[PDB]
From Swiss-Prot, chain A:
Regulates the trafficking and gating properties of AMPA-selective glutamate receptors (AMPARs). Promotes their targeting to the cell membrane and synapses and modulates their gating properties by slowing their rates of activation, deactivation and desensitization. Does not show subunit-specific AMPA receptor regulation and regulates all AMPAR subunits. Thought to stabilize the calcium channel in an inactivated (closed) state. The chain crosses the membrane at residues 1-16, 26-46. This is Voltage-dependent calcium channel gamma-2 subunit. The lineage of its organism: Eukaryota, Metazoa, Chordata, Craniata, Vertebrata. The L-type calcium channel is composed of five subunits: alpha-1, alpha-2/delta, beta and gamma. Interacts with the PDZ domains of DLG4/PSD-95 and DLG1/SAP97. May interact with GOPC. Acts as an auxiliary subunit for AMPA-selective glutamate receptors (AMPARs). Found in a complex with GRIA1, GRIA2, GRIA3, GRIA4, CNIH2, CNIH3, CACNG3, CACNG4, CACNG5, CACNG7 and CACNG8. Interacts with GRIA1 and GRIA2. Interacts with MPP2. Belongs to the PMP-22/EMP/MP20 family. CACNG subfamily. It is found in: Membrane; Synapse, Synaptosome.
UniProtKB/Swiss-Prot annotation, chain B:
This is Glutamate receptor 2. It comes from Rattus norvegicus (Rat). Ionotropic glutamate receptor that functions as a ligand-gated cation channel, gated by L-glutamate and glutamatergic agonists such as alpha-amino-3-hydroxy-5-methyl-4-isoxazolepropionic acid (AMPA), quisqualic acid, and kainic acid. L-glutamate acts as an excitatory neurotransmitter at many synapses in the central nervous system and plays an important role in fast excitatory synaptic transmission. The gene is Gria2. It is found in: Cell membrane; Postsynaptic cell membrane; Postsynaptic density membrane. It comes from the Eukaryota. Detected in forebrain. Detected in dendrites of neuronal cells. Expressed in the pyramidal cell layers of CA1 and CA3 and in the granule cell layer of the dentate gyrus. Belongs to the glutamate-gated ion channel (TC 1.A.10.1) family. GRIA2 subfamily.
């Protein structure tokens, strides 16, 4: 779920890229959100696979 | 104190010497009971064991 939320927030950042632009730190925000979403997703996969060993 | 015993009472020589038993109403034998296999959650941080 946290992976889904982080992906949504990264989408909002990339959308705010075109408007309200020239900030140059909202694109970095989108990058950080997408990488963090990936890390959350991989933790979720390991936890799921581990919970099904019993 | 009792006139008859109707229970899972095993016919044994030492008992038959002091009481009477009918022929067997159940055939059986000693056996082993174990807690089943289950498993073994390897714990997180067991790579340090």
């Amino acid at each position: 779920i946290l992976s889904v939320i982080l992906l949504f927030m990264g989408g909002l950042c990339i959308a705010a890229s075109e408007f309200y632009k020239t900030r140059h730190n909202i694109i970095l925000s989108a990058g950080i959100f997408f990488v963090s979403a990936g890390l959350s997703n991989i933790i979720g996969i390991i936890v799921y696979i581990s919970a099904n060993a019993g | 104190k009792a006139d008859i015993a109707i229970a899972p009472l095993t016919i044994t020589l030492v008992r038959e010497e002091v009481i009477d038993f009918s022929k067997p109403f159940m055939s059986l034998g000693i056996s082993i009971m174990i807690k089943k296999p289950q498993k073994s959650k390897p714990g997180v941080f067991s790579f340090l064991d």
